């Protein structure tokens, strides 16, 4: 199992999205992360106080997880940080950063328009956090001067002074990960003709953002607590723990590291390099050359599929699996590990029809029944029966696979020396085989219907196919040309009730799709039904008696 914690169990009621304040990234962190080395204390078999577990997460079936201990199947893994040499853009915002610069003064950090402009006070009024930022921008982008005095809220003759600074605002454009401005200028009233062309440094953008008023940035999307605009530009880098980027130690000359561990090491190496350059005699242009390398590695780590930029590739020619790309597609973490996931107590095989099964039942192959299990609680009502299936064991049909004690530890009836002399106690759980009349979820994929997943009664049968009643064919959209179907087993009394009480086959007969029956008589039975019911059709006594007896609820009246 997973051991007990005195902590109160609660449910998640709200999720508060935001950006990481570098102060916080530093504060959470449990390790510095100084070296691009994985482990190998120079040709050794232990992690290096530098990258993965410098003080961090734990792996390799070993507890050591900084006092926390626990090890793998309990430790969530805790974060490290990396201190970046110079600020870099977070690839995802790069544009929100650009837009914020476009809205504010690149010298004083004040909104280019305010309460004095009518269109502004109107857009400022917008309740929607995103729509107001959207409107504020289309207005402020155009404004290329920080105004000192603006016409009063009555007369355009006597101009009232707002905030100071007269400075000209650059025309910002992106040059992939870089933001470069083009200042309008003045020179003999004309100029530009040929303006001031300079790239805006992370550090300068950071400083303006630091000076943006709480009231101002709050008028823009931003929140003073959870997401200040200064927190978009990366200064400190949260380093994810091994769980997020697993390693594998094959055979002493084979070892596999995750693409992130590679990408991190490049960030680090590029960092260590640029740190040495700034410390030493800064050659200006050899530094900004090393900065836009760091910028690339950090950027390409969160996103490798960047438009305009070259991909970071991994020796074999394949591009590095960035973080973005793990979340993204179907088969991503969202579409494929959360919104849908493979499951245990599942079973699949070829389906075949049966005129002798009842509408709501499902023929389950003995082998499938002998694998799938229901955890039943030992109770005065079942105690004797359960003890017998336990005695029967994992190989006999109505048998069991495991016994779950109060203590939490699982007894494997297949190997336990005490699998014979096993004496049950009320409250224990017997993980017993799936048995005739258990409710089970039966499903035929695609599943574009609620009727594509229905609850059936088990009927353990021989032969390797799932047998279904022919009239239930239509809702699933199944045939027996080589179709396979899925079976899911509920594990709780609650879950079972859900199946039997809401989604059982008989309930599903009249469907709301078209307010009519979604199952009817088909094929042989449809063909035979016409033939039987003609005026011409007469049956002799002998056959009438068999035909009558065949009806399972027949009154006994000829």
């Amino acid at each position: 199992g997973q051991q007990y914690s005195s902590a109160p169990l609660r449910t998640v009621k709200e999720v508060q999205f935001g950006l990481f304040s570098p102060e916080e990234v530093r504060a959470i962190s449990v390790a510095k992360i100084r070296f691009p080395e994985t482990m190998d204390e120079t040709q050794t078999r232990a992690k290096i106080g530098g990258l993965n577990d410098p003080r961090l997460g734990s792996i390799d079936r070993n507890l050591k997880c900084q006092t926390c201990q626990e090890g793998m199947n309990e430790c969530p893994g805790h974060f490290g940080h990396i201190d970046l040499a110079k600020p870099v853009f977070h690839v995802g915002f790069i544009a929100k950063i650009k837009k914020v610069c476009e809205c504010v003064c690149m010298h004083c950090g004040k909104l280019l328009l305010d309460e004095h402009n009518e269109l502004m006070r109107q857009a400022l009024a917008i309740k929607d956090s995103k729509k107001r930022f959207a409107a504020i921008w289309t207005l402020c982008k155009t404004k290329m001067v920080c105004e000192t005095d603006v016409p009063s809220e009555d007369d355009p003759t006597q101009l009232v002074s707002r905030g100071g600074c007269g400075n000209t605002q650059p025309t910002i454009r992106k040059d992939g990960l870089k933001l470069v401005g083009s200042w309008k200028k003045d020179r003999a009233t004309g100029d530009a003709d040929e303006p001031e062309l300079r790239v805006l440094s992370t550090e300068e953008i950071l400083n303006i953002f630091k000076h943006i008023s709480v009231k101002d940035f709050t008028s823009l999307g931003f929140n003073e607590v959870f997401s200040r605009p200064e927190w978009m530009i990366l200064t400190c880098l949260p380093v994810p723990p091994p769980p997020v980027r697993p390693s594998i130690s094959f055979n002493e000359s084979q070892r596999g590291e995750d693409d992130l561990t590679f990408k991190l090491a490049d960030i680090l190496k590029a960092n260590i390099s640029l740190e040495t350059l700034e410390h030493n005699g800064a050659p200006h242009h050899a530094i900004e050359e090393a900065e836009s390398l760091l910028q690339f590695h950090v950027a390409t780590y969160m996103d490798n599929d960047i438009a305009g930029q070259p991909q970071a590739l991994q020796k074999s020619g394949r591009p590095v699996k960035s973080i973005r790309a793990r979340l993204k597609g179907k088969e991503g973490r969202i579409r494929g590990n959360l919104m849908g996931k493979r499951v245990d107590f599942s079973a699949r095989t070829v389906i075949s029809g049966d005129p002798n099964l009842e509408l709501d039942q499902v023929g389950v192959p003995k082998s499938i029944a002998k694998t799938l299990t229901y955890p039943e609680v030992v109770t005065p009502y079942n105690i004797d029966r359960l003890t017998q299936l336990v005695r029967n064991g994992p190989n006999e049909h109505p048998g069991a696979k495991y016994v779950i004690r109060d203590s939490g530890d699982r007894i494997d009836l297949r190997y336990s020396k005490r699998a014979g002399d096993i004496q049950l106690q009320y409250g224990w759980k017997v993980e017993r085989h799936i048995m005739d009349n258990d409710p089970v979820l039966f499903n035929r994929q695609p599943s574009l219907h609620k009727m594509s997943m229905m609850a059936h009664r088990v009927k353990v049968i021989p032969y390797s196919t799932f047998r279904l009643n022919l009239s239930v064919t239509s809702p699933y959209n199944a045939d027996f040309d080589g179709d396979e179907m899925n079976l899911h087993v509920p594990q709780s009394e609650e879950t079972r009730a859900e199946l039997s009480q809401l989604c059982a086959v008989p309930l599903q007969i009249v469907s709301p799709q078209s307010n009519k029956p979604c199952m009817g008589i088909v094929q042989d039975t449809l063909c035979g039904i016409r033939k039987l019911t003609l005026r011409d059709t007469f049956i002799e006594l002998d056959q009438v008696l068999n035909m009558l007896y065949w009806v399972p609820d027949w009154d006994g009246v000829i």
Binding site: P8, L9, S492, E494
Partner: protein, 171 residues
Amino acid sequence: MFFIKDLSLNITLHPSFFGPRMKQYLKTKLLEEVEGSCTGKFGYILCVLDYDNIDIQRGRILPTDGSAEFNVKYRAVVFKPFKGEVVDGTVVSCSQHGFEVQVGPMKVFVTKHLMPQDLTFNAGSNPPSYQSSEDVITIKSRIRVKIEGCISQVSSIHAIGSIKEDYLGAI
């Protein structure tokens, strides 16, 4: 000081206790958990008031487990000390460093240095005492202290205090 505070505690009752002596066991477990307790937020939770009217409310059954969880809303007498609070207490311990004073549930310690200069340590006494020109402070003596500051320490709150200023000291 010494407050009456309205408080609530979530209790998780196992199904086996879903008998008629349920409220009785809840009210009991409440008292076991809350009474005696010392928190930073509330101080010493000393005595739960109005036993006969402790609001149990309806307990929500926790889904995968059997157990029900209730938010037992109650009201109790608390003692939360503060810096600047002038308190009266009895000396308990006394050493070359100062003396501890018992103020209800908590101990407030007075440094040799947080007392006037005239009061000096006398080791040569049973029990060890502090001696002024006029006064004698020892294990049984009653003192009026000014709390200089508190430290929220686990299952207690301890504090440092002076008897140097005016209207403080022996009583």
